[PDB]
XYZ file of C-alpha atoms in Angstrom:
257
model
C -29.131 -37.015 -11.178
C -29.312 -34.563 -8.249
C -30.288 -30.942 -8.714
C -27.728 -28.473 -7.391
C -27.734 -24.711 -6.893
C -24.332 -24.314 -8.564
C -24.471 -23.298 -12.217
C -21.380 -25.375 -12.887
C -20.550 -28.829 -11.556
C -18.413 -31.879 -12.226
C -17.256 -35.045 -10.544
C -15.174 -38.038 -11.530
C -13.745 -41.197 -10.028
C -10.322 -39.897 -9.028
C -8.600 -43.208 -9.603
C -10.066 -44.045 -13.010
C -10.948 -40.629 -14.396
C -14.469 -41.740 -15.270
C -17.029 -38.911 -15.223
C -19.792 -39.341 -12.663
C -21.554 -36.019 -12.869
C -21.764 -33.008 -15.156
C -23.602 -29.702 -15.283
C -22.094 -27.137 -17.655
C -18.862 -29.012 -16.930
C -16.919 -27.180 -19.645
C -18.436 -23.720 -19.359
C -15.880 -21.091 -18.303
C -16.554 -19.174 -15.098
C -14.550 -17.049 -12.685
C -12.758 -19.158 -10.093
C -11.979 -16.791 -7.261
C -9.933 -18.298 -4.445
C -10.164 -21.890 -5.738
C -7.224 -20.576 -7.782
C -5.135 -21.211 -4.676
C -5.226 -24.899 -5.529
C -2.935 -24.211 -8.484
C -0.705 -21.967 -6.388
C -0.079 -24.851 -3.975
C 0.388 -27.349 -6.815
C 2.957 -25.151 -8.574
C 4.891 -24.598 -5.323
C 4.909 -28.310 -4.479
C 6.230 -29.007 -7.986
C 9.291 -26.761 -7.626
C 12.695 -28.409 -8.045
C 14.136 -26.011 -5.486
C 11.394 -26.853 -2.982
C 12.232 -27.041 0.728
C 9.273 -27.285 3.087
C 11.455 -26.208 6.008
C 12.806 -23.143 4.205
C 11.828 -20.030 6.155
C 10.411 -16.919 4.540
C 10.382 -13.477 6.158
C 6.897 -11.992 6.091
C 7.227 -8.717 4.224
C 5.134 -5.619 4.853
C 3.957 -6.007 1.249
C 2.088 -9.231 2.019
C 0.315 -7.517 4.899
C -0.530 -4.339 2.988
C -1.811 -6.554 0.191
C -4.607 -8.119 2.230
C -5.566 -4.765 3.739
C -5.566 -3.103 0.305
C -8.014 -5.774 -0.821
C -9.713 -6.458 2.512
C -8.995 -10.042 1.474
C -8.761 -13.284 3.427
C -5.571 -13.722 5.376
C -3.556 -16.077 7.556
C -2.717 -13.112 9.804
C 0.998 -13.415 9.077
C 2.952 -10.868 11.147
C 5.558 -8.908 9.188
C 9.061 -9.657 10.409
C 8.164 -13.235 11.356
C 10.022 -16.165 9.807
C 7.457 -18.639 8.474
C 8.317 -21.955 6.807
C 7.046 -22.871 3.340
C 5.131 -25.733 4.953
C 3.334 -23.355 7.351
C 2.651 -21.072 4.394
C 0.904 -23.932 2.589
C -1.385 -24.392 5.603
C -2.011 -20.656 5.777
C -2.873 -20.692 2.109
C -5.188 -23.683 2.153
C -6.993 -23.620 5.493
C -7.984 -19.985 6.114
C -7.394 -19.146 2.434
C -4.690 -16.607 3.282
C -3.936 -14.187 0.483
C -0.905 -12.959 2.409
C 0.415 -16.543 2.368
C -0.217 -16.865 -1.381
C 1.740 -13.665 -2.015
C 4.622 -14.968 0.085
C 4.631 -18.238 -1.893
C 4.452 -16.520 -5.299
C 7.252 -14.161 -4.245
C 9.369 -17.069 -3.076
C 8.952 -19.421 -6.039
C 8.583 -17.025 -8.923
C 11.732 -16.281 -10.928
C 13.090 -12.743 -10.990
C 15.111 -9.998 -9.317
C 12.154 -8.054 -7.908
C 8.942 -9.163 -6.166
C 6.957 -7.747 -9.087
C 9.010 -9.825 -11.535
C 8.787 -12.983 -9.447
C 5.006 -12.622 -9.096
C 4.527 -12.255 -12.850
C 6.805 -15.251 -13.303
C 4.852 -17.318 -10.776
C 1.510 -16.710 -12.510
C 3.146 -17.724 -15.783
C 4.194 -20.937 -14.034
C 0.544 -21.451 -13.094
C -0.578 -21.184 -16.704
C 2.220 -23.477 -17.846
C 1.106 -26.087 -15.335
C -2.410 -25.823 -16.776
C -1.153 -26.241 -20.343
C 0.916 -29.262 -19.278
C -2.279 -30.860 -18.023
C -3.719 -30.450 -21.523
C -6.328 -27.919 -20.415
C -7.893 -25.395 -22.784
C -10.464 -23.588 -20.638
C -8.271 -22.396 -17.783
C -6.353 -19.144 -17.458
C -4.752 -17.460 -14.473
C -4.315 -13.741 -13.999
C -3.366 -13.919 -10.326
C -1.694 -16.120 -7.711
C -4.671 -15.984 -5.349
C -7.726 -15.649 -7.565
C -8.220 -11.941 -6.821
C -9.003 -13.250 -17.180
C -8.971 -15.639 -14.205
C -11.291 -18.440 -15.198
C -11.678 -22.194 -15.398
C -14.391 -24.829 -15.607
C -15.690 -27.505 -13.202
C -13.905 -30.163 -15.286
C -10.586 -28.311 -15.680
C -10.467 -27.401 -11.993
C -11.293 -30.984 -11.043
C -8.357 -32.231 -13.121
C -6.067 -29.661 -11.560
C -7.127 -30.824 -8.098
C -6.666 -34.482 -9.048
C -3.122 -33.743 -10.203
C -2.405 -31.823 -6.989
C -3.834 -34.680 -4.907
C -1.001 -36.812 -6.282
C 1.338 -34.988 -3.888
C 1.320 -36.390 -0.351
C 2.014 -32.987 1.229
C -0.944 -31.522 -0.654
C -3.196 -34.364 0.555
C -2.055 -33.875 4.143
C -2.786 -30.141 4.147
C -6.222 -30.183 2.561
C -7.653 -32.767 4.939
C -6.416 -30.890 8.024
C -9.292 -29.262 9.908
C -7.164 -27.175 12.254
C -3.553 -26.040 12.344
C -1.629 -23.800 14.732
C 1.524 -22.195 13.365
C 4.505 -21.631 15.662
C 6.500 -18.930 13.915
C 9.841 -17.309 14.642
C 9.527 -13.729 15.750
C 11.562 -10.791 14.441
C 13.689 -11.102 17.592
C 14.191 -14.880 17.459
C 11.287 -15.688 19.769
C 8.761 -18.424 19.071
C 5.251 -17.178 18.450
C 2.122 -19.300 18.753
C -0.301 -17.959 16.200
C -4.048 -18.205 16.665
C -5.245 -21.526 15.243
C -6.066 -21.732 11.527
C -9.313 -23.534 10.735
C -10.112 -25.068 7.352
C -13.015 -23.275 5.675
C -14.133 -26.559 4.114
C -17.042 -27.722 6.243
C -17.229 -31.097 4.493
C -14.202 -32.290 6.472
C -16.487 -32.507 9.495
C -19.933 -32.933 7.908
C -19.273 -35.475 5.153
C -18.012 -38.907 6.179
C -14.975 -39.768 4.079
C -14.292 -36.155 3.023
C -10.599 -35.554 2.298
C -10.581 -32.181 0.558
C -10.079 -30.000 -1.218
C -10.640 -26.236 -1.171
C -13.475 -23.751 -0.832
C -13.566 -20.712 -3.077
C -15.490 -17.519 -3.573
C -15.382 -14.162 -5.250
C -17.519 -11.233 -6.433
C -17.859 -12.897 -9.845
C -17.048 -16.498 -8.891
C -19.697 -16.557 -6.146
C -19.479 -19.627 -3.881
C -17.284 -22.441 -5.094
C -16.009 -25.727 -3.701
C -13.582 -28.336 -5.001
C -14.365 -31.490 -2.998
C -13.064 -35.041 -2.627
C -13.932 -38.012 -0.470
C -13.086 -41.676 -0.252
C -15.363 -44.532 0.715
C -14.571 -48.194 0.208
C -11.384 -47.432 -1.667
C -13.455 -45.350 -4.104
C -12.498 -41.686 -4.333
C -14.875 -39.103 -5.775
C -13.439 -35.716 -6.688
C -15.425 -32.842 -8.144
C -15.988 -29.123 -8.357
C -19.027 -26.954 -7.838
C -18.837 -23.446 -9.322
C -20.981 -20.426 -8.535
C -23.316 -21.895 -5.953
C -25.562 -19.424 -4.133
C -24.147 -19.557 -0.605
C -21.747 -21.283 1.778
C -24.366 -23.812 2.983
C -25.619 -24.287 -0.591
C -22.126 -24.972 -1.915
C -21.756 -27.655 0.762
C -25.105 -29.331 0.089
C -24.365 -29.199 -3.649
C -21.097 -31.056 -3.117
C -22.740 -33.489 -0.702
C -25.467 -34.371 -3.206
C -22.993 -34.907 -6.025
C -20.712 -37.086 -3.897
C -23.578 -39.234 -2.590
C -24.814 -39.632 -6.167
C -21.322 -40.480 -7.373
C -20.865 -43.156 -4.719
C -24.253 -44.725 -5.438
C -23.769 -44.714 -9.212
């Protein structure tokens, strides 16, 4: 069993559900931006979903990232951005402006505030439906927001069942071509996936990096080799390189087991 810097860790065979690795697998910790995995999952599960539906970037999304100095997809207010592009903005650069736009769009209510509260409730419902007991969401971006390496791994596994989700998370780079306030086509600067495993770990297919003041450095990873898919989560590692080596060690162990 490898030694990892993360205080929390878990991994299972994605296809069979058999546990391959544990380290405080059921101990609750802050999740930070790995929360975005649930945001995507909820969106992709909407009955009224339309990937080509365009959303107008509101000033509120922009002010939101500035007010928190948070990660962003650099969405320009006034631009028309499709739900599909928003999913890439959410998952690759970990855009909190994109998350807001998605929560606003798929939450139920007559005001943005109401729809956001509704969206987060949808996130908790999704967790309950998965039979989880150690996961709770207080936000749509991860900015009372906790989970565990096991719970998060199950959430990711469920999300990986959606082909669109799988496509997004394994994409290393994506350039959004948005529609300007005046009808023009804008070529945004290229979005790069923050998950370094996609290029460092052979077979890597996901899923999403995460971090936060309390969550520290997190990573939900997945890779396939020989038709065998290992999916796991590392919570509260000590750094970006450490989170990656932690995941690498667990995956190698899981494949050799």
